[PDB]
Write a protein that binds this ligand. Sequence first.
Ligand SMILES: OC[C@H]1O[C@H](O[C@H]2[C@H](O)[C@@H](O)[C@@H](O[C@H]3[C@H](O)[C@@H](O)[C@@H](O[C@H]4[C@H](O)[C@@H](O)[C@@H](O[C@H]5[C@H](O)[C@@H](O)[C@H](O)O[C@@H]5CO)O[C@@H]4CO)O[C@@H]3CO)O[C@@H]2CO)[C@H](O)[C@@H](O)[C@@H]1O
Ligand SMILES: OC[C@H]1O[C@H](O[C@H]2[C@H](O)[C@@H](O)[C@@H](O[C@H]3[C@H](O)[C@@H](O)[C@@H](O[C@H]4[C@H](O)[C@@H](O)[C@@H](O)O[C@@H]4CO)O[C@@H]3CO)O[C@@H]2CO)[C@H](O)[C@@H](O)[C@@H]1O
Ligand SMILES: OC[C@H]1O[C@H](O[C@H]2[C@H](O)[C@@H](O)[C@@H](O[C@H]3[C@H](O)[C@@H](O)[C@@H](O)O[C@@H]3CO)O[C@@H]2CO)[C@H](O)[C@@H](O)[C@@H]1O
Ligand SMILES: OC[C@H]1O[C@H](O[C@H]2[C@H](O)[C@@H](O)[C@@H](O)O[C@@H]2CO)[C@H](O)[C@@H](O)[C@@H]1O
Ligand SMILES: [Ca+2]
Length: 516
Amino acid sequence: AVNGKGMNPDYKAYLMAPLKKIPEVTNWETFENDLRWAKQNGFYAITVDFWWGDMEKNGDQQFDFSYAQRFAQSVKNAGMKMIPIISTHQCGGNVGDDCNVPIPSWVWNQKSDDSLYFKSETGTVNKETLNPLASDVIRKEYGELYTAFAAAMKPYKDVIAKIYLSGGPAGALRYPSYTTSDGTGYPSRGKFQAYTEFAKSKFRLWVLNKYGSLNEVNKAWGTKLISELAILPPSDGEQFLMNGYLSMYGKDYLEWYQGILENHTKLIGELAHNAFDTTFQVPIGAKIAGVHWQYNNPTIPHGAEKPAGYNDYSHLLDAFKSAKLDVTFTCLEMTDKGSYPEYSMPKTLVQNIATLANEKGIVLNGENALSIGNEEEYKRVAEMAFNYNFAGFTLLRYQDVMYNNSLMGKFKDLLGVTPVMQTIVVKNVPTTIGDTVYITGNRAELGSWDTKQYPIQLYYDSHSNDWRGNVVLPAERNIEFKAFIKSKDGTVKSWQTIQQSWNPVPLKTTSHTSSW
Ligand SMILES: OC[C@H]1O[C@H](O[C@H]2[C@H](O)[C@@H](O)[C@@H](O[C@H]3[C@H](O)[C@@H](O)[C@@H](O[C@H]4[C@H](O)[C@@H](O)[C@@H](O[C@H]5[C@H](O)[C@@H](O)[C@H](O)O[C@@H]5CO)O[C@@H]4CO)O[C@@H]3CO)O[C@@H]2CO)[C@H](O)[C@@H](O)[C@@H]1O
Ligand SMILES: OC[C@H]1O[C@H](O[C@H]2[C@H](O)[C@@H](O)[C@@H](O[C@H]3[C@H](O)[C@@H](O)[C@@H](O[C@H]4[C@H](O)[C@@H](O)[C@@H](O)O[C@@H]4CO)O[C@@H]3CO)O[C@@H]2CO)[C@H](O)[C@@H](O)[C@@H]1O
Ligand SMILES: OC[C@H]1O[C@H](O[C@H]2[C@H](O)[C@@H](O)[C@@H](O[C@H]3[C@H](O)[C@@H](O)[C@@H](O)O[C@@H]3CO)O[C@@H]2CO)[C@H](O)[C@@H](O)[C@@H]1O
Ligand SMILES: OC[C@H]1O[C@H](O[C@H]2[C@H](O)[C@@H](O)[C@@H](O)O[C@@H]2CO)[C@H](O)[C@@H](O)[C@@H]1O
Ligand SMILES: [Ca+2]
C-alpha cells in the first residue's frame, strides 16, 4: 500500500441488502440461505435500510419496528451479522432507488415556517430529509427514534455488528444539490440549497455574530452592503462558483454552509451514542457521498461538490472524528476521466479522502457507487481498498452477486478475503549504505507490481543479516511477489532473482523465507 504499508488487518467485506423489504423480494427461508452463501463467500455482515417512513408512519411516537425485528430474527437464524441503517431519509428519486418511502409526512407539520425543508437557488423545494439547520426538531425526532429503536432491538444485540446513521439525502451527510426537478442531476453543476427564508436568516445571523456589525462585515469582506438584508447567500450560483468563492465573502459563506453539516454530524453522533452505546456498544458511522463530477472544471472548480456542501474535506472529516463516527466513502470502483463535459475525477477524490482519514486516525470504510457487472471493477475496488488502508468494503447491492454465481466467485476471490499476518524473510540481499528493501506482488494486497507508490517495506535484521517484515496478506489466495531495492533517492536499483509465490497464503500465521 501507500507509505510502505499493507492492507488493513481489520478489513471486512459487507453486503448491502435490497432497498425493499425482503418479503417483497424473496421468502425468509431463502433469505437465510442467501446469507449463509454470502458468508461462505467472505461477507462478514449485511447492511440494511430501516426506513423512517416505515418505523414512525402513523404519527409522532407511533412506532413500528416489526419488520426490523423479523429481519434480525432471520439474520440470527442464519448465524450472520447485520448493520442497521437508521434511514431518516426518503427512499426514491436517487440513483439506483426502486422504492418510494418518504419520511413520515406528519413531520412537516411540526413547524409553520420553512425551517424544515430545502429550497434551491431557483426555488426548488426538497423534502427528502429534514433541513439540518432545524437542530431543535432533529434533536427531538432523531433522539426519540434512536431511543425507541434501541429498546425494540435490544434482544438482537448479539447480531448487530455496527450502526449507520443517515446524515442527509440517499443516506449521506450532504445537501440535495443534484436532483432532476432542480435540473441539477449528474453531470450538471449543483445548486446551493440555502434559499428558504429560515436559511437566509440563519446565514445573516451567523455573519453578524462573527463580525458584530454590518460595518465590520463590509470591512472584512471589502464590500459596500447598504443594510443587513443585503447579507445573503449567492444570488448567482454560476458566478459564485466561477470567482465568488475566492473572496473573503465566499470563504465565509462556504464556512457557514459546510459548517451546518459539521454541526449536524456532531449532533446525530451525540444522539446515536447516547441511544446505542449502553445497549449495543458497537461502532457508529455516517456516510459521505462521492461527488466526482465537475471536479476539475476550469470554469467552475469543484462545481458539484461545493453546492453539495463539500468545500474542505479535512475540516469535514474533523467533525466525524469529534463525533466519534466512522466514515464511509464511495466510488471506489471508478477511474479518473477529468474530461469535458463531466470533468470526473472519482479516483483522485477517493485517494484524497483516504489520505485525510488515515492521517486523522479515522476508521475508513468504502462502497461502490454503481452496480458492478465485471471483474475489472472489482480489481479497481481492490486497488483502492487494500492500498489506502480501508477497514471495510460494502458491495452495492445484494441481487448483483446473489443471482450471479460467476460474479459472486470473482468477488470472493478479489474482495471476500480474510486478512492474515505473515512474516516475509529475504536473504542475501546486496544492499549498500542508504538502500531500502520492499516487496511488491500481483494482487492488489501487494500493490500489483507497483514500486513507486504501493510497495511494502522490509527491515534489515542485523542479527541474521537478512531483511524481514510482518505483512498482512489475503488468506487462502495464491500470490506471486518479488523483493527489490531502492537507493537513497528512491530509484529502483535491482530485483530479486526468482519470482516468489505462495500457493496459497496459509490460513495460519507463519513465515515465507526466500533468497535474493
Ligand atoms: O442502502 C444504502 C443506500 O443506498 C443508496 O444510496 C447509495 C447510492 O446508491 C450510491 O450511489 C452512493 O451515493 C452517491 C454516490 O456516491 C455518488 O457518486 C453519486 O452517484 C452518481 C454517480 O457516481 C454518477 O455516475 C451518476 O450516475 C449515473 C450513471 O453514471 C449512469 O450510468 C446511470 O444511467 O444514471 C446514474 C444517475 O444519473 O450520477 C450519480 C448521482 O445521481 O450520488 C449518489 C447519491 O447520493 O452511496 C449511497 C449510500 O450507500 C440509496 O439511495 C439510499 O437510500 C440507501 O440508504
Ligand atoms: O452577502 C453579500 C452579497 O453576497 C453575494 O454576492 C457575492 C457573489 O455571490 C460572489 O460571486 C461575488 O460576486 C462577484 C461576481 O461573482 C463577479 O462575477 C464580479 O461581479 C460583477 C457582475 O458580473 C456585474 O454584473 C455587476 O454586478 O458588477 C459586479 C462587480 O464587478 O464581481 C462580484 C463582486 O466581486 O461577491 C459578491 C459579494 O461581494 C450575493 O449575490 C449578494 O446578493 C449579497 O448582497
Ligand atoms: O502489469 C501486468 C504484468 O504483470 C506481470 O509482470 C510483473 C512481473 O511478474 C514481476 O516480476 C515484475 O517484473 C520485473 C522483474 O521481476 C524484474 O526482474 C525486472 O525485469 O523488472 C521487471 C519489471 O517490473 O513486475 C511485472 C509488472 O511490472 C506479468 O508477468 C506481465 O506479463 C504482465 O504484463
Ligand atoms: O468549462 C467548460 C464549461 O463549464 C461549465 O459548463 C458545465 C455546466 O455548468 C454543467 O451544468 C454541465 O452542463 O456541464 C457543462 C460542461 O462542463 C460552464 O457553465 C461553461 O460556461 C463552461 O464553458
Ligand atoms: Ca418522535
